[PDB]
């Protein structure tokens with residue numbers, strides 16, 4: 108077995124070279140984690156998708172611990188089926204699409220603030236970290252008067268492992284905050300997700316208040332650090348590929364395809380941020396490998412998203428790519444609930460940056476940039492820019 112996680116490459120713009128070497132040779136390999144558990148990794152686009160779509164792979168694994176047990180992402184059917192069907196009574200494509208104008212305003216506000224800071228200015232702290240929380244607040248219905256405090260909580264959640272106590276205490280505050288917000292929204296409902304969910308809960312469905320709380324925090328948690336890290340990594344990738352970036356410069360029509368190309372090419376982790384699945388029966392894969400029952404299986408999204416069988420010239424960035432069946436939002440029943448909302452946030456963020464800061468560049472050499480050591484997601488410590 109080879110050791111997983113692989114070494115981090117010198118450059119934030121490279122993936123571990125062992126991924127492509129596996130994908131393109133042995134394909135499915137055994138790995139060994141640092142705690143000595145042994146697993147399997149699959150790398151081809153067909154195997155990764157199978158691992159996410161097939162019924163034989165299970166996701167089932169303090170306030171923090173309870174919430175993890177209550178989150179969609181750790182559930183299997185039938186519990187997962189029920190909860191998702193309850194949440195999507197309110198979390199709809201219509202709700203998300205109709206938020207686009209407010210997302211655009213929130214992006215503009217943050218850029219209005221950014222452009223008055225001393226320069227060069229860190230994009231991470233001053234834009235990428237706060238934007239996904241603003242958007243989540245707007246979706247959920249957290250009022251602006253609660254937002255400074257809500258940011259402080261959210262940001263405490265992103266700590267290290269070195270701060271288990273900070274994070275647990277932030278989680279506790281968020282849990283009591285959302286209980287109070289439910290009573291305010293029951294009395295004065297508004298156009299937001301919590302108001303609708305409460306109305307569903309108060310009607311005849313079995314949706315509970317606690318489930319509303321667990322949904323709210325699960326959305327925060329799924330959608331803050333992911334989106335945050337991707338905004339900054341996307342900008343770096345684009346800058347590293349100036350002929351791709353030029354195709355976008357006065358051409359906001361091209362932004363949606365570019366975002367999907369960036370999602371494909373700039374991964375959250377080796378597995379797209381997806382926790383290894385557990386097989387519940389043996390499973391035959393596209394190449395004839397049969398994964399055994401009871402096995403921990405890593406779906407290598409990052410490399411499947413460059414599989415030369417599905418993506419032409421897949422190890423390079425092409426922001427014009429039309430044919431892009433990427434797995435960055437997963438597939439099957441756990442397919443990212445926020446997939447459309449995330450696309451909208453990244454589209455609006457990137458289109459505005461390029462519109463407003465068309466000469467944006469890095470204020471340090473790209474070799475000086477580095478991924479945070481102590482993060483579960485691939486993300487920059489800082490991103491010093493000027494324009």
Ligand code: HEM
Pocket residue numbers: 159166179180181191325326327329330331333334337375379380381382434435436437438440441442443444445446448449
């Ligand atoms: C670039 C931003 C994002 C990426 C790349 C991302 C990716 C993913 C992936 C790969 C999964 C599947 C996990 C699995 O199969 O185990 C997932 C699940 C989830 N996503 Fe996202 N996501 C992002 C943003 C968001 C946002 C903004 C929200 C806000 C709603 C969100 C809400 C969730 C939820 C609730 C789940 C669990 C769905 C379920 O288990 O049924 N995500 N996401």
Ligand SMILES: [K+]
Pocket residue numbers: 111112113114123377
């Ligand atoms: K790795």
Ligand SMILES: [K+]
Pocket residue numbers: 177178179180321322323324325326
């Ligand atoms: K959830």
